[PDB]
């Protein structure tokens, strides 16, 4: 409902789907023929089945193929620096495939649409959908376009008869944040005691040996620390 | 480019129903408001109805309320006028037309730049 | 609402002359942002009319530049400085302040 789902956005008012509890099968997506860009930042695109994160946002919108390079962190142009702003410590990516058939027609599809003019570049992680219109000149518009007032927002103009850079390319953007809950298929084996181990508790890995602990918990704390990021107690996640 | 077609509008019998498409093909029919015009044969016009973005704010004109129904359809880029209880001074040349308006103070009854093709409405 | 005038109605101008057209309205149509709100039109026989000054004083789009509006407040008048036999049209006046969009009676303009 993510990928297939039938219209997607516009970038300056994209659409969010939450991700949470849930098992995700990232072999089908890195195993496609039909995703053109896959590229991942922070995490290998191999190793996703194995990561376990605490919740997942799928960002959804329409560019032209020309500009799926912007949509990286620290990149400039116009769409990210006034639609979609990803920021510089990114964790999770950002995939395109062609939907030429879908999203571009004869006599050009004016419904995907995007800003061109604001006073300012957009913070990462907070998108707007005003409608105010701008005023590059002296002249205060007051509320009316014209010259040196200019709305912000206009359409694409989705030709099939451009090039592969002009055509409508569906970004969709997955982003990680590191108790997690959406995480690939492995066999929750059964806990080993009092053995130097490899343990991989819910992601937190690492290796060590596995006793009870005499110390009381509270039933909202996951794992235990004692100092200086040292695992010291954790919870069985069943 | 920019060009706005018809639909309908034609041979009906008073106090009933009748259908009017207006569907837009160059420009971007989310930001630009909308408005509907009456002229009847031997005088000129009469604004009767205008919509804001997206629905929510629906306008009528002083012999039009609730005589009219007006709906919007922002996927397949159509404007709708549902049609109740036809009369014979509203035997008109009906066609829709847009406005420039998307500032705050533009007034989308305002500023109409284009004006559709034009069809007219026998009510008979 | 707003009592509006176009007068005189009939209008038969020589080719060549100029042609002054003037529409009048009950209220104020000067908003508190300075501008004005009245808007002029044309009705071509069997075409579909056009606007020709939207605010009183600027460009339409395709609207030849002999075409100039003036005015402020309440009494405002239409000048072209050429009148041909492609301006022949009747000239209409149209407000956007209150609830009602307010036509005017139509300006025939006549060749002679």
């Known amino acids: 409902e993510v990928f297939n789902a039938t219209r997607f956005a516009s970038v300056y008012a994209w659409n969010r789907k939450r991700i949470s509890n849930c098992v995700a099968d990232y072999s089908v997506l890195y195993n496609s023929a039909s995703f053109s860009t896959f590229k991942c930042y922070g995490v290998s695109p191999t190793k996703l089945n194995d990561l376990c994160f605490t919740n997942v946002y799928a960002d959804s919108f329409v560019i032209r193929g020309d500009e799926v390079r912007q949509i990286a962190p620290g990149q400039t142009g116009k769409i990210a620096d006034y639609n979609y702003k990803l920021p510089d410590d990114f964790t999770g990516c950002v995939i395109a495939w062609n939907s030429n058939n879908l999203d571009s027609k004869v006599g050009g599809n004016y419904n995907y649409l995007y800003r061109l003019f604001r006073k300012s570049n957009l913070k990462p992680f907070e998108r707007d959908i005003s409608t105010e219109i701008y005023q590059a000149g002296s002249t205060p518009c007051n509320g009316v376009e014209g010259f040196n007032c200019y709305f912000p927002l206009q359409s694409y103009g989705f030709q099939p008869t451009n090039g592969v850079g002009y055509q409508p390319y569906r970004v969709v953007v997955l982003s990680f944040e590191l108790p997690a809950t959406v995480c690939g298929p492995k066999k929750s084996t059964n806990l080993v005691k009092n053995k130097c181990v490899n343990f991989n508790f819910n992601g937190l890995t690492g290796t060590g040996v596995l006793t009870e602990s005499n110390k009381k918990f509270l039933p909202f704390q996951q794992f235990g620390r004692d100092i200086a990021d040292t695992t010291d107690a954790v919870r069985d996640p069943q | 480019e920019v060009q706005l077609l018809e639909s309908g509008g034609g041979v009906v019998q008073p106090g009933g129903s009748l259908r009017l498409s207006c569907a837009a093909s160059?420009?971007?029919?989310?930001?630009?408001?909308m408005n509907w015009v009456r002229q009847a044969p031997g005088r000129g016009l009469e604004w009767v109805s205008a919509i804001s973005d997206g629905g929510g704010s629906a306008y009528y004109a002083d012999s039009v309320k609730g005589r009219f129904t007006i709906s919007r359809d922002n996927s397949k880029n159509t404007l709708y006028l549902q049609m109740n209880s036809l009369r014979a001074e509203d035997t008109a040349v009906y066609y829709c037309a847009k406005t420039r308006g998307r500032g705050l103070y533009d007034y989308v009854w305002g500023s109409k730049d284009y004006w559709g093709q034009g069809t007219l409405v026998t009510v008979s | 609402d707003i009592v509006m005038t176009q007068s005189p109605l009939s209008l038969p101008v020589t080719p060549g002359e100029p042609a002054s057209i003037s529409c009048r309205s009950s209220q104020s149509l000067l908003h508190s942002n300075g501008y004005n709100y009245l808007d002029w039109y044309l009705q071509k026989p069997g075409q579909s009319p056009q606007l020709l000054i939207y605010?009183?004083?600027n460009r339409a789009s395709g609207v030849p530049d002999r075409f100039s509006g003036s005015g402020s407040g309440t009494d405002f008048t239409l000048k072209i400085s050429r009148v041909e036999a492609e301006d022949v049209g009747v000239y209409y006046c149209?407000?956007?302040?209150?609830?009602?969009?307010?036509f005017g009676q139509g300006t025939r303009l006549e060749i002679k």
């Open positions: 160059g420009f971007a029919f989310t930001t630009y408001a």
């Open positions: 149209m407000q956007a302040l209150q609830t009602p969009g307010t």
């Open positions: 605010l009183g004083s």
